[PDB]
Amino acid sequence: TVIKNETGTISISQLNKNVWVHTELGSEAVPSNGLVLNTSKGLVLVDSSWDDKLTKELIEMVEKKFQKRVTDVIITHAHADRIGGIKTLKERGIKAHSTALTAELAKKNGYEEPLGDLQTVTNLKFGNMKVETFYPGKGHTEDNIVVWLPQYNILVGGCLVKSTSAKDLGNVADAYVNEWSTSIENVLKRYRNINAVVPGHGEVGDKGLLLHTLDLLK
Ligand SMILES: [Zn+2]
């Protein structure tokens, strides 16, 4: 099931019972994927959106939809599509989780600072919903992390993972192209039984998306 806005810029699609994928188009419309986790104690998002207007609109949508508060957001890296709505998060009392490095880079890029609480391996539980954040090393950016939902074996790769039709790695000015391969290998070694994989943008797939990205990096 999918739910969008009248303009069509914001869409939310259900993966399973309590897991949805939020997608926003940043204008040439450029999409960005994130997750919406419906828990017994509120809504949790994996990544915000391009800017504050889109992020606020996204939050307004899911809150109206599930009739609950978005309590936390996990930021996967310090770029606009991930941390663009940080000001909106902070003004609404939404906890913006991130690694210390992501917080450092957010500041450098002119964004308000996220919590910087996430360690290399951080397990978070919101109600019955379990979430694991993992820093696999440098790739798309120096700070990129992945998110794992152990109850569903769902992997949110962020921009470290490209979609099936993607033949372009995207912006590599802040990337560590050579190390990117080792980082993907660390994700593969850590999670031996992956089901669905959500790329930074594009359609949800499986472990084959990680192999595809390694192919592009060759
Ligand atoms: Zn980026």
UniProtKB/Swiss-Prot annotation:
Its cellular-component GO annotations read: periplasmic space
Check the record and name the SMART domains matching this protein: Lactamase_B
Q: Broadest EC class? A: hydrolase
Q: Which cofactor does it need?
A: Zn(2+)
Extract the GO molecular function terms from the UniProt entry: beta-lactamase activity; zinc ion binding
What is the designated name of this protein?
A: Metallo-beta-lactamase type 2
The annotated subunit structure for this chain is:
Monomer.
Domain of life of the native organism: Bacteria
Binding residues for Zn(2+) 1: 77, 79, 140
Taxonomic lineage of this organism?
Answer: Bacteria, Bacillati, Bacillota, Bacilli, Bacillales
A biological process from GO: antibiotic catabolic process
Q: Which gene encodes it?
A: blm
**Binding residues annotated for Zn(2+) 2, in chain numbering:** 81, 159, 201
Extract the InterPro entries matched here: BcII-like_MBL-B1 (IPR047917), Beta-lactamase_class-B_CS (IPR001018), Metallo-B-lactamas (IPR001279), NDM-1-like (IPR050855), RibonucZ/Hydroxyglut_hydro (IPR036866)
Function summary: Confers resistance to the different beta-lactams antibiotics (penicillin, cephalosporin and carbapenem) via the hydrolysis of the beta-lactam ring. Active on cephalosporin and penicillin.
Q: Which family does it belong to?
A: Belongs to the metallo-beta-lactamase superfamily. Class-B beta-lactamase family.
